[PDB]
Symmetry: D2
Subunit: 493 residues, 4 copies
Amino acid sequence: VPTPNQQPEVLYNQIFINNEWHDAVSKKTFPTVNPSTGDVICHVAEGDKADVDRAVKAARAAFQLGSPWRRMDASERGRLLNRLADLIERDRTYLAALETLDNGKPYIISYLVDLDMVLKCLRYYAGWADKYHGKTIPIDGDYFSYTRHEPVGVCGQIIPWNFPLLMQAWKLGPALATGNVVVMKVAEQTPLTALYVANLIKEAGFPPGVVNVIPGFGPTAGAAIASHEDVDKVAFTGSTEVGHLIQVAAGKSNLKRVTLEIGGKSPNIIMSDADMDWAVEQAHFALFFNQGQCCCAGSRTFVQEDIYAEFVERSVARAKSRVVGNPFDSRTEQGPQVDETQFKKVLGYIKSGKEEGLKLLCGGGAAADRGYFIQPTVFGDLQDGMTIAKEEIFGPVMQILKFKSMEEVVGRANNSKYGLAAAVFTKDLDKANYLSQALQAGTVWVNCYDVFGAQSPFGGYKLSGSGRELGEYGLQAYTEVKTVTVRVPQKNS
Amino acid sequence: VPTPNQQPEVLYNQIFINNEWHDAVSKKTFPTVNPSTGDVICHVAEGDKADVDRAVKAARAAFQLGSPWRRMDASERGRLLNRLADLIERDRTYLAALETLDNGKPYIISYLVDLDMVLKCLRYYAGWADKYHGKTIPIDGDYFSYTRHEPVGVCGQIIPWNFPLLMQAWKLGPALATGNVVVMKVAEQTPLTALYVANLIKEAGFPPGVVNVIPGFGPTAGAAIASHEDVDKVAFTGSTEVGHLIQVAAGKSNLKRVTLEIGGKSPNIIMSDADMDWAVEQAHFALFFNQGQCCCAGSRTFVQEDIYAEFVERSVARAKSRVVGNPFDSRTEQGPQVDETQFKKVLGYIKSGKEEGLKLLCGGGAAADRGYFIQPTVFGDLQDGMTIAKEEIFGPVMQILKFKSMEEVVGRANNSKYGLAAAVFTKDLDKANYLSQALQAGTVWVNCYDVFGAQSPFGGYKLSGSGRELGEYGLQAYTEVKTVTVRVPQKNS
Amino acid sequence: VPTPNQQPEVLYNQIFINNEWHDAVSKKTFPTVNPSTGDVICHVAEGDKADVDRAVKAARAAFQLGSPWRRMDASERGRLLNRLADLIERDRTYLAALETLDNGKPYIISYLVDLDMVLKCLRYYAGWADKYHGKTIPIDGDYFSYTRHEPVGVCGQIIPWNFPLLMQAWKLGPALATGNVVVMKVAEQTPLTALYVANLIKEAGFPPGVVNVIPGFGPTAGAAIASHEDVDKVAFTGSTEVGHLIQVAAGKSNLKRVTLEIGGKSPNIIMSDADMDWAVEQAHFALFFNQGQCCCAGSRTFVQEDIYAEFVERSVARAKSRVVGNPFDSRTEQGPQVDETQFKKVLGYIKSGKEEGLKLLCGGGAAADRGYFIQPTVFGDLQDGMTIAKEEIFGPVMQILKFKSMEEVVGRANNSKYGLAAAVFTKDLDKANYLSQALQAGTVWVNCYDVFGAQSPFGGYKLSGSGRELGEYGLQAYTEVKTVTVRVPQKNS
Amino acid sequence: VPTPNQQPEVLYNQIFINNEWHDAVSKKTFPTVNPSTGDVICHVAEGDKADVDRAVKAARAAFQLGSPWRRMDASERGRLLNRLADLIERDRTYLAALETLDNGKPYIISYLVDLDMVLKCLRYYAGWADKYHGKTIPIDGDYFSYTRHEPVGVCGQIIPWNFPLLMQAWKLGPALATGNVVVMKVAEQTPLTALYVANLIKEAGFPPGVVNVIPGFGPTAGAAIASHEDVDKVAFTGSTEVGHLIQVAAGKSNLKRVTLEIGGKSPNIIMSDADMDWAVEQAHFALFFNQGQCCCAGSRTFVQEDIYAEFVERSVARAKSRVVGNPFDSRTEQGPQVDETQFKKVLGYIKSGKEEGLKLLCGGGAAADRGYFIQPTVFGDLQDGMTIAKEEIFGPVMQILKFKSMEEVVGRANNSKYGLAAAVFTKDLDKANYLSQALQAGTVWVNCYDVFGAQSPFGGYKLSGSGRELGEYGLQAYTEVKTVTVRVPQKNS
Ligand SMILES: NC(=O)c1ccc[n+]([C@@H]2O[C@H](COP(=O)([O-])OP(=O)(O)OC[C@H]3O[C@@H](n4cnc5c(N)ncnc54)[C@H](O)[C@@H]3O)[C@@H](O)[C@H]2O)c1
Ligand SMILES: [Sm+3]
Ligand SMILES: [Sm+3]
Ligand SMILES: [Sm+3]
Ligand SMILES: [Sm+3]
């Protein structure tokens, strides 16, 4: 991994509309902070409804029948998505460092994980551009019926701050591959990298208006997109709380298509026959990954009684060794929580757990006096009714529950409003299969966790979402089907 | 066509839950009227939230992992759907007669069109039960990734009164084929036929709880389903106005999946090289079909100037010959409008058109003093800004507009909030191709209209809906994808 | 199971062409024998090239563009396939008894297994008729490219005698569902049942010429189809030896499409962790099923040393209790071998095994002096180089080999020219996964054997075939793709 | 178009096996000639059975389970294909020049057409690598059935000389995208470019043994692959004559999978309402393109009598202006015929036509005394029974036939053993629709010709082939389906 620049230059910090950078109509700006220090990195333009409106107009124009983007070859769309990937790889070290600076996650991770996954995502959807065929349908009568899978139109895409570059990639990949136009609202906590990529979009040769990126706040620029009378589809990734708002906004207005990838409280079921060493390390990763700031985190580790104590002993030991520190330090495994708000938020949960009567196995407190660092906390002997066993903590706080039978664990694991993911650690074939099928989750990892693939769909089962976001499934939400039934002289098979 | 019984006996008039008939919790009932006479056919149980809740519980139970329906083989689901089809065909004369008595549409149509389309739909989806495969995905790393296309859960389906039996079949086919459970709310204006088929479902051998039919009112039983914390998905077909409500209800509550098949103001573009005889008859059919009570009706007939006068003269002549009368009379082409409220509503539009300054070419008034009959009205020389040229009349009121160029007609045709369908009559290949691609509609009929096929998707492009309802596409909304990524010792191609 | 008629009346015994029964052009006939007695059931007309040519002519005519069959709705094709299934079910008792009478297999099997699987197959493909869509392709340039999945043409289908009715159904289902015409050659050992179904085809309402069934001999009628200048595609199921002949014939002549489903030597790998009770019973079933006359039979039972002795002991015990007798007796598990030729052939193999130096664990000799009955033989301590461990015996002769490691078993199991199927019995997830992927077989059963599903494909990996025969895959070989690229004034997404 | 090097350096002229260049086992070589001069470009190694065997071994090893290639991620396969495309583009000018030097086609065409199509094809299939999913099948009973789309194995691919680089790309694209290994036999008349790309494969980072290129002769190296006991599948593109041989070879040997892309005699139907200017130029292109050396050339131009005379007059004038000359001259439209053998072969046909009694409208003779140049010949008033109207000329010799009705032209156009392509020029929608469905051709071009797209399949209907070569269809032939049915404790929907 290339040596990063612990202070990457911030080259772009405005609103990107029509391959041009401009300030907010109000000239307002908001600060972005480096979570590791608490110092302001720079000031980004504060987009609002006016800027959203301007962007939507730009996007609508770019989507007009006969525009370069509409007329462009599907193959060339894939070409552009690949060119974008190339530029991103060219600037891999810069983007990784900027990501870590803006987000807090370990540089090594931003580089080897995030950027790799961004590249693999864009490159994956570049190949889908000219392969998402429609169908010729054998209708009754003397007709020739077929379907056109055309773009849904102007797509509003709102993303969170946990995986800035990646969440952007997840949205842009299928949207652009299907020939859609975009008006994206990036998280105010981490806007720096998306803006840089926005410029790479221009450099890649994307037609003006195709991708519009607007930095700003939620109920401001985000809501402006959600209830816009000219945004055809909205893709939202964030809190379940805001998810409700997004959906309600669509109903009250444009009646635009909605897809939501939201919160979770994923159960991590460990059976007695599970390989301990593996089950332990993966259980650690499943929850602490990305400062515990992951939607599909295994927030409820259900360990079978026969191995509970042992597992617990090992989980605590691993949490005890987990190195928290400067994101840029090669040996730092845990960086700071994205921001103070999230910092105090997490601590509030640690407080709740202790108060509701939980076995605090690892120190639940700040790890430093400067950045927003929190100690890898592990709570033992959890009860389903406890807040920390119900609510998404989104911080390095592990919950370890004990179960006896599978009949029992299935019911318990499924007893949640969330249903984004789950995992099963077992050596037995039948137990793996039975559980996979019984768990009401968008993704069930067997003998592993957090395994993401551009080719495999991701999504929620209940209040954790609707619609899938990767693979061929990711193209569906970005397609408007058109049936054309033509009368023919005489139909034949 | 078998001679019907002008007065079919109403055998079922209660709430169907768990293969059993019960009265409403409140014991309240509401009358159902025969639009041809204005007399009450009988009184149906008035379902409300309480009944909806009891139906949802029955549905949830039927969906329980390990229940007969869950464990049932996909093939047997197809068997049950076919069995249902057979029983419906067995009772074809009865159901067509009852349909006509409760709805108003001509008996010949109920029999040859509706009932035929009902059978073709169910029989089509019976074949999909065991064929909607999931996928094995070539993911990166040593894993085995695949997807499970599982049922979405408890499906709430709300249908209108224009095609009672058909709208029900449109909903039940894909829902049942995919292994889902149903809580259906039937239109208060025409509940009788749905209830009969409800019992046929029991007789077919469908497990109790799988399909629950609730007769009642909209803001009552309908809203109860839309905002239910235990209904996983809602499928709505009705007005765009109510559609907003359905979507907002979902966001404020369960965040359930939503699909909307709503209103329209479909344009019927007639080019000068169109075969007159055909273009005229089909343009007549396009708007007057089913008492003009059709979502995708060609409510805006744009005739190219070069043939405008001639076309209009023939349109009016055709309207003048259109026989309005007793739906049971074999020569009756037009029955009465579903109910007085719709009656008064249609006349209100004829009034608007006149006042807005339109060429009333065919008498716009009642056609009788008994039932709810209205004269096949034809308005000529319409202007896009006129209400009747903007709003969905849903009655036998034809609007004929004139255009010069295609560039112009494309823009005008597309100038609408709706986008459910459209059609183009031409002998020219390039004009057919160009327009079909240019019209923002879920269905574009070329040289025909109202051609529906169980195998071809149907849906709206803007405020006319979201999601498709037929063909393979009709299965999507009823599927919940599950990605199972299993770690393997060593992956190989 | 309905009490059969020990002596079913043979109603049809000629050549079926154009919904009509006629004798062979030569008026020749050949006898069909009841293997349980050795007595002639009746005499069937002997078709040859002359009759095949007449049939092909009939088929070609029925395939003419504009014929009722070509113009027929895809849904109607499905309707006809369903009608055929219904009639077959109506005559289930008769067909089962006739099957047993002419084949030898136990009546209970013919009824509960064969006939059920025939119904399930036809019913499955009925649903495929109107669902095998083509595609609209997003080609570069101003074009509208799409594909038509049309019938391949005149299909010659040659079947074996092991599962008469079933093999017929496997061929007819996909052929007719895709709109093709048929020229079928039925096994001279068991032509009776196929002929009866042939007439049910007529009764179902199938257009004349669409399905032509020709009873006769191999190098006679079979070869006549194989090298016919007007047969578009040949589907063969038989011996690997004849398979070579069929493909060579195609290349020599019409260059028609070829698919072969041939012989096997399927390995059954039982690992130490396997549940004995089940592994032993399924291992018994995997080999002895249908008088050991099954292409995918587990002809090489590789038992892991740690449980070899124990396993063998039980295999033998089960072999010893295996009831061989009158197919019509409820207690009969094993009927006679199809015919004398196969009887002597099987005995030859038992002879071989003994001479090759094998542990004869169960008597390898005739079980009666009347019909063609053979004692369920079990050979222990087999060596890969032994003929009985190499060649397809096709009789109740069990081979039990011993293995130590997976690495070793994989290589050994794969060391065969055949590759039709394999099975793995384990409780371990990783072993199941690893083996499934490592075994070069068209079907790998895990913890079960001979599990067939109309929805899952079946086929060979090497000298055991080419192409798949069930599920959606079974439609491929019966489809001819046509790309239509039309010039459009202006292409848009 | 960059100025080429009229004498590009030949850097590679040996056999490529294991990313290494070696001479033939016999040390024999054969000359490769420049058709424009008749002078020898250089000497290439003459591969034979021995070298094929060597290559097969290399490929077999590269395909071993656990190999870098077998273990490689499908995405990485796509990455390698894209890497190869980049290297090919990097050397576009060199490759174009070398292609022209060894083939004879105009440099401008090699550059803007051939190389462009080469890049487009490879880049297209790069995207397929991780997208050709298998499926999870809803089988009956307590099982989990799914399919694995695995590589077929060692693929032998034999290509002709008309589009050297492109034919290679058509084979390599799907083969490599699906994870297969290759043993390719390149045309003795034009081996130079394939060999250079062979080295670029090495440079791209492809594992050794994955692609082996062998220059040599047909009945020698070609047949050695066709009848190899270890080549799992053979893909052939060449003459129908040799096609028979290839298929026969497969049947006599390994029983390997076969796909043939062979000769044609495509009809070009021009209706009276066809735009003359366009129909005339397209008709010219359709036959003369690539020195008339194109499999799907419109060698039977059926002009509707009403426009016959006029069309012919225009066709002749066009042929009369067609510039034949030095392939490297910007003004050259027609280069020399690949080789003397083909040169005399074409002249033989011109002699035939004259003798058969045809209207020689344009000089049917050599165009120069140096290279292999032939004058753009046009024969008028052709009769279906004439040799030149039946046999593939494969040179610049146009056949113009006259027809009266559609019914007539359909039957005539279809009266051929070939069925590779066809075209229809009409302004009428119904005529276009009717004919497209009526013509038995793998591709029917409407108002255009020779329009190829990596996304749309190409193939023959009769003696012109079997199987398709582009789009998703191109992956089918390179996939081996494996059904894995696992027993599960309890199956649920
Ligand atoms: N893959 C499968 O689906 C499948 C299924 C069942 C059986 N089989 C295989 O079939 C064989 C058992 O059946 P069989 O003894 O009847 O096979 P067989 O080769 O002797 O003959 C089978 C069919 O082909 C015909 N035929 C025979 N010789 C012919 C020739 N020279 N040219 C053209 N047609 C000819 C026969 O008359 C009969 O109709 C075994 O190899 C078994 O494994 C395969
Ligand atoms: Sm927030
Ligand atoms: Sm209402
Ligand atoms: Sm034989
Ligand atoms: Sm040759």
